[PDB]
Amino acid sequence: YYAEVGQAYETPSHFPLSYTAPFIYQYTAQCWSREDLQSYLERIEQSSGLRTIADAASRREALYTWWHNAGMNVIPLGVLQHLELVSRDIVAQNARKSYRIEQHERGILRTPEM
Amino acid sequence: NEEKWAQAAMEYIHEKNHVNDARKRQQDVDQERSIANAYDRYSAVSEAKFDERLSRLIARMSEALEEMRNLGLEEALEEAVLLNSEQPPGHYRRPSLTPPLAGYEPGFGLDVPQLRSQQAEYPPLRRPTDWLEFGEGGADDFPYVDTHKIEDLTAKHEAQLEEQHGVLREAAPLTGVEGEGWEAYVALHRKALARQHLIMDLHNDPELRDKYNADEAFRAAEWERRGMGALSIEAPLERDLELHYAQVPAYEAFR
Amino acid sequence: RLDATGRKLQKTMWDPVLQRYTLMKETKVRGPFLTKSNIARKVDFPVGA
Amino acid sequence: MNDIYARRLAQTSMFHQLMRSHGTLWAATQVTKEKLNLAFVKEEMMRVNGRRAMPLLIGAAANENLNDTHFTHLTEHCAWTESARAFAVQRQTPLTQHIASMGRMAETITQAKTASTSQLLFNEHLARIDGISEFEEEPF
Amino acid sequence: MLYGGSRVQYLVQPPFTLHKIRSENLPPPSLYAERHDLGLEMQLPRDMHVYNSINMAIQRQVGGDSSTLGGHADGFDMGAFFTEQHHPERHHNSSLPYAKHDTNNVLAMRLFPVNVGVRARTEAIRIRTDDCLQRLRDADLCAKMRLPLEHPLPLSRRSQYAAIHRVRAAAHPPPSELSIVTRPVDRLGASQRWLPLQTLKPMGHNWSAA
Amino acid sequence: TFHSQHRTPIIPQVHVHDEPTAQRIHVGYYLHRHPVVKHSPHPLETEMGYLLEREQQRYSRHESAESATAFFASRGQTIDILGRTDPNQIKGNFFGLELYQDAMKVVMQRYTPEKRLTSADLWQPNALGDAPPPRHTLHRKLDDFLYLIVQEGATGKWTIPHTARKDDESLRMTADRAISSQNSEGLDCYVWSNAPQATVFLKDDNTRLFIYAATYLAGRPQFASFEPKPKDHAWVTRHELLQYSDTFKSAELLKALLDISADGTFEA
Amino acid sequence: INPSYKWLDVEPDIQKVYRSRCMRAALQARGKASMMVAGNVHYRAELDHVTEPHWRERVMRVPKATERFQDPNYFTRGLVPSLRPLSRYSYE
Amino acid sequence: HLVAREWINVPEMKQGELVERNMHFWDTIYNVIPELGLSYPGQKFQWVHSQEFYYLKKIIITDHNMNLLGVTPMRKMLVWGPFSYYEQRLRRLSALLHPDDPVLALEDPNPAMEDKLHIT
Amino acid sequence: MPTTVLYHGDQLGPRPLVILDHSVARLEQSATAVLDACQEAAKRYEAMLSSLAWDHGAVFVPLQVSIGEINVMEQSCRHVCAVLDAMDVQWSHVLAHSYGALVAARMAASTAYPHRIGSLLLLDTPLVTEQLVRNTKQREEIAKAKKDVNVPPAELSFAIESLRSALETTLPYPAAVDKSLYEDHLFSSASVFREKGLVRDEHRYVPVRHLAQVHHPLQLLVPVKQPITDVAIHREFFGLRRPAVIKTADNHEDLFSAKCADEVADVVRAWMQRFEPDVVMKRRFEKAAKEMVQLMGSSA
Amino acid sequence: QRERDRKARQIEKLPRPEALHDFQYPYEKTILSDSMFEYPVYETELDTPQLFNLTPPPDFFIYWNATDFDRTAYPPVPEDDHRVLVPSSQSPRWIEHRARLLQYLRKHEIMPHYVPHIHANVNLSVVFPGQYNTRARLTDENGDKIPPPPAQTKMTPRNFWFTAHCGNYMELTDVQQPPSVFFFEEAPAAASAASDAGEAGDAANKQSSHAAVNYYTFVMLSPDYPYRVPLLQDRHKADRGFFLNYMVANL
Amino acid sequence: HFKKVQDTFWSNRKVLVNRIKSMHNQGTLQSAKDLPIKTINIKAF
Amino acid sequence: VLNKWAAVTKSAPPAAGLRPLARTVSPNPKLRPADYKVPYVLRTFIKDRHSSEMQHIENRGMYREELAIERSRFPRMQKTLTIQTDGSLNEREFEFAVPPVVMLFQDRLSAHRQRQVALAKIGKLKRVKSWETSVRGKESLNPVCNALVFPYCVPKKMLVRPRIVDPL
């Protein structure tokens, strides 16, 4: 839902989680109102030790175990495996952007359409 | 008339994976299984009482070479640690079933001038050092070659055994006891040549010799980068045990 | 092709009639394939009373 | 029961053949700083005595050039004189040693048949069993 | 080993170590894998409309490959492909093993007398199957109506009184209704005369297409 | 094998050249005799013989063929020199040399193999249960090793023939002359190592002994010519060396002797 | 490795790609899609190199005949799940 | 499949009188199949267990046995439990075979003529 | 370790015969009256050994019973294997008539002492009984059948009752003295098996599975008439060798008479002459002597 | 140069008759191992996988009598039985058993679909009064109706394969009696260390059920009431509840 | 299949050494390495 | 492939579970792999294919109820007595048809008793003596090390000395 499409997630990997909600929604409307996600994608930031898109990509195990033993009544794990699918993309693309900017100095010079 | 002898001779070389005996029965093939375990149960205490003695022999020899170093006989070490090359002379006897006879000459004096000949042996016995003395650049002080001719001679075999062991893993594979008996014999050489490759690197480099000897987890790390390890002999669980029903032989059971 | 075989060729092939793997003895491709020579002499099997 | 003679005649030699060999090991285990104990000498003692002989028809099998150093003839014990089967492990059997060379063409058939007879393979074999054998002082 | 190849101690091999399976790791119980694991006459051609079926030029390299997907990405090596694809064998045969082809009822090609010629067998494994289709429809029709099974269902009884519309699951009749007797003529207690379903003649067809 | 010296040179030992102020140091040699016959076969092991020699037979490389000739015969291609196929008569005249046949027919009527059990090893208890009996026969027991323990005429206790270390000699050279001098070069000795085999620090004389394992080959060990003014010698096995422990010189030395002592048995 | 040697992939799910294309082509209409996508034709040269930076060396590396035929005893002792001696070429 | 026992009670006439001789049927098989004696560590997974009779895949021994612990799953067919999940796959295959196809082949004491070796 | 021994010959040789008998007594009393106790046992062997002129000498070791529970067997072995060290002998053929048998079968079975016993000849002593072996093989199957749960308890219950209703007798004692011990410690029927009939703590004497290990060349002597130690069972366990019979003796205690003292030795000497190396060697070369001459006779 | 290289190319036209030790290793010879030929040994047989994932008896002689019809071929009991564990959150066995149980549920379509949010907390073991019966019947010899076995009082190896485990099988003959429910819970504690309560928890007058979660209700429902329909058929195209077999409350 | 591949090696060998004896004769200095089966030492022929 | 609707159709094709297709090298020199060399394994033709195809597997690692004796390598070894020149009776084994006891000349001791008396010709029989070897020919150099201990050599500042010369 997130990698094969290739959206321009302009979110750097250090933003809080509450700023991957506008992406996760566009694939989960008809399931949770947009303002409902911002109740799930905040209880994750408040309760768990995870804050950033880079964290939710490096602590997918530590996050779930929180959800199992603390969430499980409100946050539908649908969000989580959605939250894990974007956080493994926003982190991916930033690696592909940060590299694309770091060659553009070394002189590779490719256009917007690459 | 010759190629027909060879055709019958290279038949003699062929080693075929041949069946178990048809006459074997689960009533004796376990009896011979009962015998062999009744043996390593016997020989164990005869081996446990051997390697325990080298645990003592080595203790005396190490502590006798390190005492020679405290007694100030430093140069005596460097002539006593030297390898004693004189082979036990032909006078040295190998025991037989019965003692020597009191005054026996071969055939009581029936002497054959032919069977007493001086004759050959198949092996040419070329060895890894014949490329040093009996080769070009004839080393005058042969058993005292310059070190750099060892940093290269050893570097020749790791470029030769790694090639000898390449073909002998595809062209002549073999598994089981003789397999793990061949890899061990090989890996013990790629290790023995490695510590040789190591002492030289530990020798000509005057930096590393200090930090090498500085700690332990470094050498046990440096030894792990040299490929040298600690070969772990498989422990004999000879104890009478009931093998799990899935570990039974991979053939139809005996009769 | 070359006379590696003085013996007349033989093979095991699915005999589609019997639905059984049976022998296949070679023979010239032109000729009646069930002549009064392909009759087997009667024999009492090792079955029956 | 020629092996159970050999086995019990290697321990009394791997005892001695280690006495002459502990020195040269002590010198090496002083600079590598490895521990010179039973866990070290055994590994040494196996790489010198035990040498599974490869089928002698590979060419690289007949070319084993590591268990005949000036050292491996000193710490090697007497295992392969007390039973020919212990000998057919380390080397190959006294005849298969010949036929194989003719197999890999290292010696013509005529070089094999005559020099691979039941008699020569007898008096020659009992030379390796004794160690009384021709040398080539200047090996070519 | 330190003894020069004289294998005399620990001759008895120690039995090898067991490689266990984690039964939880396994795939879920799959119905479509329950059906086709056995191996039978055939499935349908995988086409009512010939699209999506399979090509005859690749019908040889199938058999369990209905599941989506070598040792590598691919290069096919031109070996074991062109070495197994057209073996020295598998040529100049006439009957290549049962691959995935919806040929005659091979489940019933095995169960039938070889005595009958071909064109009179493929016309008789169908008249066997044509009955096995009626036996199956009647059980579906009789059970769904809660009726005890009846085999030569009367065309008046068939179309179960206007094919009752299945009143609009299926249920057994109570064991009071059950009994071995199943022919309507034998159920109530028409002429009970009996005749086989088909005539098997050990005659061989006299028109071979070639 | 104990191969002959194929081409291995012999690097001798050399007089040292820097006087290191040699201290109180003796050098003794622990002489012993190679086993004259093989390990007496335990009856279990003979029951292992009928195991292997059965299995090593019924799993032969060529099963039915009785031998190489018996195999080679089956093609009519011979191995022997003279080209004989029927392997029964190859057994009659193996060598094609009829003088050998003469050299045999005499042996098979005159030869009688020697007796492994020396009557010196029919030990009798009526001799006495006292301090160890005088065991001078080097022919004592041909299965085990026979080590030399010698008692001085000084204090009666037992010792290994030991001499001091001169200044410029090594420890092999000392041990080399340590025996040849005390036997007037009348022994054929073989010191295995170029370094000692053991080491014992004394507090009585402060002396530091370097044992050396040497093998008697030939030569009558003239004892009253030894250094430590010996009373009488003893050729005892690694095992009964525990018997002299009561009269033995140094408990620090006895076990430091049993520990380098080999054995033909290893059941201890 | 070599843009001359091509495979034909059929990925079975038609909805899996249609329901993305209809997005990927609806996003890039609003100018909100990124052009560094793997499926971009001109990017694949750089895409691999962002993730696997030394993939040249992983296919260029020549294997010694020892490791290509891992110790057959490791197969009986079960260490290596199954020896494949002929699959030696990295087709990436 | 070949369903046969180790011991078969075969009658025989001794001194003109009928007496039972416990026949060791095991020796009947091994003569028929000299492949079972020649056992090598791969043969129980061999493709064709006996290249003579490639038809033969298992030999179901049916001998009443009194030991508590029966034969281990290596040599016993599981004959209890729900062998499937979604449908007992017999009643599916029980739909395809017809009430007029073979289930028996009883040998013939006196055959009508040389062909009818068994009656189906 | 006792000092009391009866060395029969004048010599003692390298590896003489170490003859055992019943557990003589307990050295809780002084060594002088127990000396007399083992002095009568020799009077059964003093005869047999005389005919068997043994070129190695012959020994007799006394064995004490334990002040405790487990010290009955482990003591006697270390007690025997010491008297082999005080004599400078390993691999001594042994004879046995009584509890002096189990000790050999306790050494020759277990590790840590399998090289002291070279041979083992049983005079009349049964090591196992049909009742004791046909039961223990079930005590191993019930052990699983008590564990595994598929088994039907109608067969399980039947197999247990048939295991106690046909329980094991003590080993028949081939003497009068240890009739205590064979019923006191070794097979104290109230102690050797807990969970009556089902598990038998055979670690005191030896677990029967280990009596299915002893391949020390074993022989049984048997009086032709009514014996103890039925031959039928022993040939099954200790390999298919027929135990040579004493065709003259009636029962036990008649092996030692004058009627048999020659052949009970003239079949035992045949046993010592199966493992003495100089004996087997002379029959070996003199074999090849008579072998070779067959080739010189066929040379014409 | 031109003809030598030609002769050099004649050397490559020359035959290479090279006798081999044995057959070439990859192509003709092959290496067998214990991994290739081994009976499937499930590390844990909770799901009773032998009865479903059948594997042919590899051997040639397959001993099948008639009496092997009676025997109920249940798996062997595994030691360290899960039923006696306690569901603490630090017990190493439990953590293993916690996921292995949730492993089995995902395998059997249950966890994410039928029972969405399983908060695996307590060590439920629903022992059934079981007789290892092959079929419902009457006592054979006694000519009596079999007395319905009493309510299970203790967990035991014999009552292992008659519990409710991760998908195991039970012959319906055994389940015909109401099930005995053994469940152990650990989650209630006086505090995060049961400390500083200062006799609180004692002031809770229902200690065994003092918490708002400690009176438990055991409901048993059978999802496949008419027949076992595939998930992917029934998951989507029907909305029907489950057959409620049993429901005890206030446990 | 077997008999045809065992005998050929004996004709296929005699083709090698005969032709290589000549391909040595022609002055082509043929060391033990450049030729197909290395283990031959022509000086033995 | 013939389907159900063909003008002529065929009977049951063979289920492949019997008479399988061996995956063996195509005779076509293009369809055989690279490493493949023509198998000139000279061998006594084993007739029955039960014992033939067995060679094509390598099952020395597979578990065995028997003991793991190294089989099919040691050909068949006939023991025979060898009476050494001093009458010390050994016993060794050979594969070919050796007779029983073989008289032996040219033993180890006889060779040594030959070299001595031949060294008695030059009179050097007696011995060369180390302590009496006050011959002190040597030299010390920096980058030098023994060569006889090549696998376990050690480099250091090593004294150089010539070997012993034995005329024989």
From TrEMBL, chain A:
This is Uncharacterized protein. It comes from the Eukaryota. The chain holds residues 115 to 228 of 284 of the full protein.
UniProtKB/TrEMBL annotation, chain D:
InterPro entries: mL96-like. This is Uncharacterized protein.
Automatic annotation (TrEMBL), chain F:
This is Large ribosomal subunit protein mL46 N-terminal domain-containing protein. It comes from Leishmania major. GO terms for molecular function: structural constituent of ribosome. GO terms for cellular component: cytoplasm; mitochondrial large ribosomal subunit. Residues 24-121 form the Large ribosomal subunit protein mL46 N-terminal domain. It comes from the Eukaryota.
TrEMBL record, chain J:
Residues 1-13 have a biased composition (Basic and acidic residues). It comes from the Eukaryota. This is Phosphatidylethanolamine-binding protein.
